[model samples]
Target: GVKTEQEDVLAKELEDVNKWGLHVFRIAELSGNRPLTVIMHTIFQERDLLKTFKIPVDTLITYLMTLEDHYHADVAYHNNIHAADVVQSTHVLLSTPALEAVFTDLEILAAIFASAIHDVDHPGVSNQFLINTNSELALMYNDSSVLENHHLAVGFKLLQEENCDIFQNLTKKQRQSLRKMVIDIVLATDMSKHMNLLADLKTMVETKKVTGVLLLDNYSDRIQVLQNMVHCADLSNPTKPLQLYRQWTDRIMEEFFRQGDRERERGMEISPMCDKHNASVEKSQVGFIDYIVHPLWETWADLVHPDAQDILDTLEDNREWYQSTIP
Candidate 1:
């Protein structure tokens, strides 16, 4: 069995296993992409260049271990592993052929880290729920993008520890660049950012602006890529290989069904994507890709080329699986 103790669970992965112990170290090798770990590993692999930034991989990992303890998100689902996957997806997107020459190691680092920590404090519900119940997150963020802001703040706040000060050694100038980029990527995780994120990415590609003009790519050009990268990761579940994708779909449906049952029990109205109990299964997923996943992945495919082909194939297969079962 996989060990759950924070100390023993990932004792092997840590460079200094005796001291800080394991973080929420996901088995990135299990997944095709090791997005989050890849990013941190990349940073460490090229430690010489980013040494001034001071983001120790172990520190970041250890902090991630305790990162979401305060929040009520489920450790099994929507946990650090998923964050790892998203970051991996983000990394792959950055490394794709078209964007390779443009994005620097710094840009990749910030985007990947943001993906791994984007949902640090998710409360298992959507932004609307926070507003409906007047949850603190809703009140604090004014409901505009409540869950998003909470996640961004929670992720960075966990880095306050000395052992976890992934950014501790950065000079003021380095901190400024890293700070803005991290914040940009995290906030972009919001579903609210979906449409605009896609639009901006397409525009950037169209204009071929190359942000920073082959010199000083400012926040504007740099962050657009980050936003779309995260959005792509968020929408990546459907694009996974069929076997793996089915497992993810089952979990999401289970989550949705559970939420649906709760709403029914509480005499509340069912919400879209939450009506798991009465889900159309095939049609819902068909609707999902058509209305949600398709637009997102289609756009992402356009951006990433053959990288997303398997994703599209799995989506089609999943849709067929549902159709066959809908008797």
Candidate 2:
């Protein structure tokens, strides 16, 4: 079924996708910019979840390609490439042997799907910007998580379509469970929700218990863990290999600077870390690593035990590199 030259290349890359190893930008190019489709296909088929759930391969592929198109290719940071990156990173986080033992297949599926479409149809601006400018999305969502709310609404709307209903094979009960879990994870990805999520993660780690029994037995426990896992994946940039991390940094900063340019034109005070005029990329990264990234990954490293130690090391090393380059 892999017919095109691009599909063939993606198939090859899928053979090699791994934690801290897969290069999504390269995969995007090789897959003819079909990043989400390639990543989802490999992840689903490799785990045999597609076969397990009796998802029609052709239908799934069609839905994913359509979903991929929903992500505007021109957006600098929140494009399909970013979705694929989060999907891959979430795959790695889920693959940890310890954490792997905790999630059900359903929760796993929710996490993967949540990562893939977390930022679909992004407006290339922060939620605050939408609120400040009285944008339509800001009003629709009532000023809270404007972009995230839009992404979730549009994503589910797409899923509700006939051809794009990849979950059609599921029973009604299963679909209901899957939809709730997916919504929780996606909504939790909003930065406004970050502190609460991370605080919950810290609490879990602090009061963590040992057991052969399932660590996540109830919906509350299960979905919280899935939320943190996807959250970690979203914030995983500094934990990536330096070259990959640098590429993402450039993309995000460029996007931020563009937003700052817009803010200036509108006579609004530029947000912190978004100003092109001051452009302290390295210093901003140092602060980001020290404040946001480090605390989060450190807790995540604890969750996955030694499995993510190497990635934690990578984050610290990358932090020092950014620290050194601040000039």
Candidate 3:
């Protein structure tokens, strides 16, 4: 009875999950850090993904819980809460009217799964830190998209657990398609790929033939769109409401400072934006918006047109707010 009551409260809190500016932090607080699992289950159910993919709900839950457990609860950023936010953001992106009926159900499933597992087992450090330190994961992945590869490998490996193989019902071909799409989506989240992904997106937006309707006529085009969608969601914090966005900025800066501390201890140079002592939080955020976040969002806004105008407006407002604070 108590368990049912708790679930009812969580369901109530999630009523706004479909909203573009949903406050995921409340869900994190209410659910006790199981936000990713809770939100993923809701999205899967809402999208009719479980039934359409022939996935057992219980199995999916088990898998989601297992995946959530891998996220470092102690980490200030890139934790389960961030994963939950990304999943919800991706769902909102997919639900935009411009993208209506554009992606197949299988592609939708892959996008959600990719966002959910994009940063699994994140160690609260950047890839450059791992490479500089010659960490095991860096060596394992050959220092190329190291963290992204580790997330994908660990996420897929968890499926081998008994009663946690959410894809058990899928055919071999279906599994292959899902795995490939998830890989592409997750790998694109690596910041190293940002320029290439943004350039490709800008090109796609500029060279498109159809005006009234979006056309993704081939596998390459479809996968590219899905990739950019997940990438946008991964970088969506600045586009959120100011209060919520400030919370994320605080967490990420905290994580970056921790990494900076470690680098100092080892007598290595601190990565950009990691040095808390010398860093200007407001300036860094403004620069982040000007260089990285704005360009990608501008391209994405172009692709989605009026559907993302409000989000772009929010991003601009947030950028100006940060700019004004920088002294």
lDDT of 2 by residue, 62-98 (tens): 8888888899877788899999989988888887877
The 10 consecutive residues of candidate 1 with the worst lDDT sum are 16-25
Q: Estimate each model's TM-score.
A: 0.78, 0.95, 0.97
Q: Per-residue lDDT of 1-327 in model 3, one digit per residue for the tens?
A: 256776677889899989977878888878877899989988998999988988998899999999999999999998999999999999999998888888889899999999999999999999999999989999999999999999999999999998999998899999999999999999999988999998899989998745466888888888998999999999999999999999999999999999999999999998998888899999889989999999999999988887999999999999999998978
What's the lDDT of the predicted structure labeled candidate 3? 0.92
Superposed model 1: Cα runs more than 4 Å off: 1-52, 68-76, 208-218, 306-310
lDDT (10s digit) by residue, model 1, range 241-302? 55656666776776667666667787878778778656676677777777777776766666
Candidate 1 TM-score over all chains jointly: 0.78
lDDT of 1: 0.64
Candidate 2 weakest lDDT stretch, 10 residues: 209-218
Q: Once superposed on the true structure, which residue ranges of model 3 sit more than 4 Å away at CA?
A: 1-6
